[PDB]
Amino acid sequence: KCSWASYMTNSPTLIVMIGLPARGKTYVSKKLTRYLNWIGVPTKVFNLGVYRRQAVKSYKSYDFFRHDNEEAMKIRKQCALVALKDVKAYLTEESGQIAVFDATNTTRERRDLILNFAEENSFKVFFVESVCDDPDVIAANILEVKVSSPDYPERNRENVMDDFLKRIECYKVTYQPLDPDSHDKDLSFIKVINVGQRFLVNKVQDYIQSKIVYYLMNIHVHPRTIYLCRHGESEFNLLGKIGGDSGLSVRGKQFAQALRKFLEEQEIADLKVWTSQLKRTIQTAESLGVTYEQWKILNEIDAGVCEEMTYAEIQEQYPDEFALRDEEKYLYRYPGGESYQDLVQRLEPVIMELERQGNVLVISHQAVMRCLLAYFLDKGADELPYLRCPLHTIFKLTPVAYGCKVETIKLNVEAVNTHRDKPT
Numbered sequence: 001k002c003s004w005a006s007y008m009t010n011s012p013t014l015i016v017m018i019g020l021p022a023r024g025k026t027y028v029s030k031k032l033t034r035y036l037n038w039i040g041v042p043t044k045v046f047n048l049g050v051y052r053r054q055a056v057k058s059y060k061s062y063d064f065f066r067h068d069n070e071e072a073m074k075i076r077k078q079c080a081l082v083a084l085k086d087v088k089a090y091l092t093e094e095s096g097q098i099a100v101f102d103a104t105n106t107t108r109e110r111r112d113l114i115l116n117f118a119e120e121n122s123f124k125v126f127f128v129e130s131v132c133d134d135p136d137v138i139a140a141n142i143l144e145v146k147v148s149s150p151d152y153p154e155r156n157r158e159n160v161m162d163d164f165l166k167r168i169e170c171y172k173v174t175y176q177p178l179d180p181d182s183h184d185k186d187l188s189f190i191k192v193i194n195v196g197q198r199f200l201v202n203k204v205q206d207y208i209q210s211k212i213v214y215y216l217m218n219i220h221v222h223p224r225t226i227y228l229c230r231h232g233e234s235e236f237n238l239l240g241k242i243g244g245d246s247g248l249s250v251r252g253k254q255f256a257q258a259l260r261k262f263l264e265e266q267e268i269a270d271l272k273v274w275t276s277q278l279k280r281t282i283q284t285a286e287s288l289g290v291t292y293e294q295w296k297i298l299n300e301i302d303a304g305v306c307e308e309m310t311y312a313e314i315q316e317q318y319p320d321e322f323a324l325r326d327e328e329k330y331l332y333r334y335p336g337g338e339s340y341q342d343l344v345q346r347l348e349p350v351i352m353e354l355e356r357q358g359n360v361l362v363i364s365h366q367a368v369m370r371c372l373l374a375y376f377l378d379k380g381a382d383e384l385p386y387l388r389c390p391l392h393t394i395f396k397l398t399p400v401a402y403g404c405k406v407e408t409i410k411l412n413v414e415a416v417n418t419h420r421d422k423p424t
């Protein structure tokens with residue numbers, strides 16, 4: 001029942017973040033967790049800032065982060081111990097597989113505490129250290145996420161900036177970066193340097209660490225927009241037939257023309273356009289006046305022996321299978337075809353190239369687009385096969401703060417509904 005990636009995960013793993021404040025640790029933690037869950041590895045983030053704010057519930061100044069503030073250090077360490085006990089419960093009672101421990105973890109002593117904890121429980125440990133000393137990057141990071149964060153009340157960014165830079169200075173006093181030449185030569189880790197310009201990778205142990213490294217080395221923080229839509233309405237859509245390779249209806253062609261105008265009105269810089277190899281997506285892109293790329297792996301879910309049938313026909317001919325699919329829509333594999341779980345695996349190179357690229361429009365299909373949207377919007381396997389992705393609607397995805405905003409844009413061309421709810 002588990003995904004391929006989860007099949008390749010054995011002992012539970014602790015991903016341990018390291019770095020000074022405002023180095024993207026929370027951003028990376030959340031994003032890596034979203035990716036790992038989407039590929040089928042149960043993962044949870046443990047944000048030590050959340051624990052500490054819950055414990056302290058006050059607007060502390062940089063004074064709280066001094067290494068010689070004994071009472072603050074005691075509280076901060078207690079928060080780490082509590083979070084680690086929660087990590088242990090997640091990975092041993094709740095069937096978690098990866099815990100992402102999002103804290104500064106800037107001293108050898110604190111990292112030894114985590115390593116000893118992991119050894120007590122036979123967890124593997126992989127560190128992700130973010131290193132950046134460009135003051136323009138740090139200032140931008142502070143303005144982007146720290147000025148309007150729960151650590152601070154309403155007050156001008158100037159004063160918040162001042163306090164947060166002093167906080168950073170407190171951590172610099174005791175910061176011991178990972179050192180692969182001596183102290184840390186046997187630890188497994190990646191240093192992400194200068195916002196992904198440079199990386200140092202040491203002692204990758206296993207499959208999941210290799211995948212984590214590849215992912216982290218191919219993401220970026222440059223602003224851009226991802227657009228997702230389906231092909232224009234197809235002949236088979238009008239007949240309720242699944243799969244196939246039918247062409248656009250005249251109304252799907254009208255949508256394609258409306259999509260051309262939408263793009264001609266947006267003037268999105270350097271927009272890449274990707275389609276599948278199925279005629280209905282190709283014909284949609286042909287109307288746009290742009291060059292585009294056809295990806296075989298964007299083809300719609302394979303319904304196997306059920307290709308080109310209506311749901312009514314499938315239920316009549318295969319009643320037990322049809323009922324099984326309604327009970328387990330994510331995991332059910334069509335005979336001779338695919339499950340949504342298979343489709344997620346097939347789409348992983350799409351996700352990776354979307355991460356590498358800038359502005360992209362993907363013209364695909366109902367099931368494919370559910371999978372892609374679930375990745376960007378952090379939707380689990382229960383929800384993924386039921387996300388609503390109407391024909392003739394564009395989903396505009398904007399990376400925003402720690403996640404992704406979604407706006408739906410319905411173009412003014414009607415279409416049949418192809419969304420089948422789970423019965424009763």
Ligand SMILES: Nc1ncnc2c1ncn2[C@@H]1O[C@H](COP(=O)(O)OP(=O)(O)O)[C@@H](O)[C@H]1O
Nearest residue numbers: 021022023024025026027130132141144195221
């Ligand atoms: N490798 C990185 N290095 C530096 N900044 C990054 C990196 N990755 C993401 N960011 C930036 O970090 C900001 C978010 O910071 P945050 O995750 O809250 O920092 P931290 O948890 O280290 O205090 C965002 O502006 C994001 O663009």
Ligand SMILES: O=P(O)(O)OC[C@H]1O[C@](O)(CO)[C@@H](O)[C@@H]1O
Nearest residue numbers: 241242243300303365366367418
């Ligand atoms: O998983 P569901 O809800 O049957 O949706 C997938 C189906 O949707 C369609 O894109 C449109 O009917 C079919 O080609 C495909 O088999």
